[PDB]
Design an enzyme around this catalytic site. Structure first.
Site, mmCIF file in Angstrom:
data_model
loop_
_atom_site.group_PDB
_atom_site.id
_atom_site.type_symbol
_atom_site.label_atom_id
_atom_site.label_comp_id
_atom_site.label_asym_id
_atom_site.label_seq_id
_atom_site.Cartn_x
_atom_site.Cartn_y
_atom_site.Cartn_z
ATOM 1 N N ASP D 87 0.758 -1.239 -0.255
ATOM 2 C CA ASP D 87 0.094 -0.099 0.011
ATOM 3 C C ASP D 87 0.836 1.291 -0.046
ATOM 4 O O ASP D 87 0.325 2.281 -0.632
ATOM 5 C CB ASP D 87 -1.010 0.066 1.130
ATOM 6 C CG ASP D 87 -1.990 -1.102 1.288
ATOM 7 O OD1 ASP D 87 -2.701 -1.242 0.246
ATOM 8 O OD2 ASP D 87 -1.884 -1.851 2.097
ATOM 9 N N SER D 112 1.865 7.053 1.379
ATOM 10 C CA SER D 112 0.909 6.073 2.162
ATOM 11 C C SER D 112 -0.364 6.629 1.754
ATOM 12 O O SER D 112 -0.914 7.401 2.250
ATOM 13 C CB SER D 112 1.075 6.385 3.667
ATOM 14 O OG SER D 112 0.168 5.718 4.598
ATOM 15 N N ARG D 113 -0.920 5.561 1.059
ATOM 16 C CA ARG D 113 -2.508 5.842 0.419
ATOM 17 C C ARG D 113 -3.221 5.899 1.534
ATOM 18 O O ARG D 113 -4.299 6.483 1.572
ATOM 19 C CB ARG D 113 -2.528 4.617 -0.563
ATOM 20 C CG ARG D 113 -1.740 4.866 -1.704
ATOM 21 C CD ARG D 113 -2.225 3.770 -2.863
ATOM 22 N NE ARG D 113 -1.261 3.707 -3.876
ATOM 23 C CZ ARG D 113 -0.099 2.692 -3.981
ATOM 24 N NH1 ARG D 113 0.210 2.216 -2.880
ATOM 25 N NH2 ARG D 113 0.672 2.825 -4.965
ATOM 26 N N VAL D 114 -2.932 4.932 2.545
ATOM 27 C CA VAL D 114 -4.293 4.770 3.653
ATOM 28 C C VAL D 114 -4.233 6.033 4.654
ATOM 29 O O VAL D 114 -5.271 6.366 5.467
ATOM 30 C CB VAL D 114 -3.828 3.336 4.376
ATOM 31 C CG1 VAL D 114 -5.063 3.242 5.510
ATOM 32 C CG2 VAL D 114 -3.948 2.132 3.703
ATOM 33 N N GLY D 115 -3.199 6.823 4.515
ATOM 34 C CA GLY D 115 -3.183 7.958 5.213
ATOM 35 C C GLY D 115 -4.064 8.985 5.511
ATOM 36 O O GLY D 115 -5.097 9.086 4.630
#
Lengths: 55, 119, 171, 249, 119, 124
Positions: D87, D112-115
């Site tokens: 990710d 960090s895409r989930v950031g």
């Protein structure tokens, strides 16, 4: 007035050497880049040939 | 083994400061080559001044190297090395020439060699 | 190293080359601007010189041969330096000669004093311990007459006291 | 329903072992002599980490694979294979390591895409500004080579970036609670640090943590319970009191 | 498809003007960073002033960005965006703060945001 | 004819890199810059519309002999189009002479024709 114009002339004549040195460094680094990348490509060719022959 | 709890806070700080100075001097090479030595700030000029001397001080004369050149070589304790590098970092020997720091033992030999060269 | 590290250096060097080219062009433009005034101001200086040279066959308070008129203290020299950098040795040599003459020669550190023009001159004299009186931080590059006039009147006025009898420029 | 953290120490060593086995088994080699199913192996391994739904018990498993590169060659086979799967990535660099910035995370490269969803509200409030400040500082960082002779506006951004870099520095084996990280980042981003010299910032941070331990426990408990910043004036007054008590070198 | 006969003469002119202003701004960034912005020619000051607003106005809020922002999106027709960029190019909005143009839809919403910020 | 065009374009391409400043010296900067800009303007062409070699000769001669000095840079394309219309209307002798002998026509006659066109051209 003489000092101001001398300042401008000095900056102009310094930037010429700055740019020439920068372009000389560019030339050297680009030559190194290509002469290194050729080794990688011939290594890839050698690995492919050896892997084909191993079978 | 380069940890504060193993070698001591003073040793650790000296080592890290030396490494930081050498890294900065390595980074400054492009601007030094292009714009010249005179265009750097008064900080980076001192950085180069300290870094060249530290880099030359890291060299040493060895006992077995006597068969190459006639210099006899010396053995330097850790306390002396740390003290000498702290002294250099404080700027005590900023006035001595670069060649005084080449191929010597303890820091006192640098002063002795500078006196021999005339300083 | 590797290509991944070489390419970053090449990119940074190219960016610096472009910056240097742009600043060289700007310097050339300002050079033409300065050279305009360098010839435009001639008639006024000729007008003043032709008349003062005409009436310069007499003795006056200061413009006579001012032989040993107040050598007592504070010999004053003028220093003209820029503010911006990248000029190379232009400012450095002017600072060098001022230092190696007055700081070398004059024994008592206050029998001389200097007034500066330019940021770098006052920066070097804050590095040193020289007795600097006043300066101009950043003049506009334009010829600035009727703007430099008050500085010039101050310079000649603090001369008129005899504070700096031996006035002698470095530039 | 438990929560698990898993760390794979070297996927490059794992891939090298698999390559050795494949070569000994006489399977055809791909690029860099690696077998063709090396990507399938890593994807099958990594995709077993998940956040289960509530009907499944709510458990989760998070993975931190490690990949070692030689001379920063991130375009090699295994590096690209692992990068395309995960990710996000964190890039550590030796040049940043030696210049004093440790841990050596490179903010420009790391992603960090989930950031955002992975942060609390109070932390997001200040990280939003910290991102822009660091981006502007890194964009203008190139012109510091031309000496201190710069424009008036840019020098403030250079000073802010330098102080930010000093704040982000950290020593070994000293995890910091998020309720203190948010406070120190707020102190940095609100300009309370814009008069402390760059050289004394780490000592400022340590003394600020001690001052917060001694006084201002209400701020810490408010953050720890509501996951949000306290009232603005109270936090500013606490920071002002610490700044009045703190002695510079 | 960016051709005069496909999108229209006015659309092509607006697009070309926007691209040219952005390209012009790209060449002035280093100079403005190094020297004070006053050394710019007075036309170039307007060029920068408008390039910043164009760059900010190109941004847009999305309906799917709700999960990351808590703010609803927008839908802007091309017939409206050409008019908005024409007005910005001709300078009908040089009197607003640049932050009013960020993450916004139609040009009227820019004025609404500016007045909300207190213009 | 093409030699002067080649030289002018080569000289101008050096001054293109000098985009910051204009009139430093009229001979060295301004004249070369303006003529090269007009050269670049005349060398542009529209899609799927080739033009005959004789008309190419006439327009390139017009550029390289300085007959286009007065015409501003922005109106050069309309100048060229209206020149082609004027040629198709009143230059059959020149067109046939070049199309048959592969050589330039009488210079005085060609100058008179281009002067006549320039009288009728309107700058805006």
């Amino acid at each position: 007035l003489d000092a101001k114009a001398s300042e401008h002339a000095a900056r102009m004549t310094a930037m010429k050497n700055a740019t020439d040195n920068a372009n000389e460094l560019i030339r050297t680094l680009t030559l190194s880049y290509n002469r290194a990348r050729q080794a990688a490509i011939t290594q890839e060719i050698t690995e492919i040939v050896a892997g084909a022959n191993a079978l | 083994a380069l940890a504060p709890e193993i070698v001591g806070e003073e040793h650790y700080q000296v080592a890290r400061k030396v490494q930081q100075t050498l890294q900065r001097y390595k980074e400054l090479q492009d601007i030094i080559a292009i714009l010249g030595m005179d265009e750097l700030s008064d900080e980076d000029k001192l950085v180069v001044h300290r870094a060249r001397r530290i880099q030359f001080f890291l060299s040493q004369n060895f006992h077995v190297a006597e068969q190459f050149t006639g210099q006899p070589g010396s053995y330097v304790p850790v306390k002396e090395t740390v003290r000498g590098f702290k002294e250099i970092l404080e700027g005590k020997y900023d006035h001595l020439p670069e060649d005084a720091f080449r191929l010597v033992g303890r820091i006192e030999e640098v002063v002795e060699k500078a006196k021999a060269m005339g300083v | 190293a590797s290509l991944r590290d070489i390419k970053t250096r090449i990119n940074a060097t190219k960016k610096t080359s472009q910056i240097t080219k742009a600043m060289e062009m700007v310097s050339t433009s300002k050079l033409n601007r300065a050279e305009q005034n360098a010839k435009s101001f001639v008639p006024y200086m000729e007008k003043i010189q032709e008349v003062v040279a005409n009436v310069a066959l007499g003795a006056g308070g200061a413009s006579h041969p001012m032989l040993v008129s107040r050598p007592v203290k504070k010999t004053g020299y003028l220093v003209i330096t820029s503010d911006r950098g990248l000029a190379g040795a232009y400012n450095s040599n002017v600072l060098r000669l001022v230092y190696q003459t007055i700081q070398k020669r004059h024994a008592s550190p206050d029998e001389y004093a200097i007034i500066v023009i330019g940021r770098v001159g006052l920066s070097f004299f804050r590095k040193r311990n020289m007795p600097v009186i006043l300066d101009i931080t950043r003049l506009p590059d334009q010829p600035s007459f009727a703007d430099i006039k008050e500085i010039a009147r101050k310079t000649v006025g603090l001369f008129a006291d005899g504070t700096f009898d031996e006035l002698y420029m470095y530039y | 329903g438990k929560h698990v953290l898993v760390v794979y120490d070297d996927l490059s060593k794992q891939a090298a072992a698999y390559r050795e086995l494949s070569l000994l088994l006489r399977r055809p080699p791909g690029r860099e002599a690696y077998p063709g199913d090396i990507f399938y192996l890593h994807s099958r391994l990594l995709e077993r980490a998940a956040k289960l739904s509530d009907a499944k018990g709510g458990g989760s498993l998070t993975a931190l694979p490690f990949v070692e590169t030689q001379a920063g060659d991130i375009s090699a086979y295994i590096p690209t294979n692992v990068i395309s799967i995960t990710d996000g990535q964190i890039f550590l660099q030796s040049d940043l390591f030696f210049s004093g910035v440790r841990p050596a995370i490179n903010a420009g490269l790391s992603v960090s895409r989930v950031g955002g969803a992975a942060q609390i509200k109070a932390m997001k409030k200040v990280a939003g500004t910290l991102r822009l400040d660091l981006a502007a500082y890194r964009e203008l960082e190139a012109f510091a080579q031309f000496g201190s002779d710069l424009d008036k506006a840019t020098q403030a951004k250079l000073a802010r970036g330098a102080r930010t870099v000093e704040v982000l520095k950290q020593d070994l084996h000293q995890p910091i609670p998020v309720e203190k990280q948010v406070l120190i980042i707020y102190a940095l981003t609100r300009g309370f640090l814009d008069d402390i010299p760059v050289e004394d910032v780490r000592r400022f941070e340590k003394e600020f943590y001690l001052f917060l331990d001694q006084n201002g426990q209400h701020l810490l408990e408010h953050i720890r319970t509501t996951k949000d910043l306290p009232n603005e004036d109270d936090l500013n007054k606490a920071i002002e009191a610490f700044k009045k008590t703190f002695v510079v070198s």
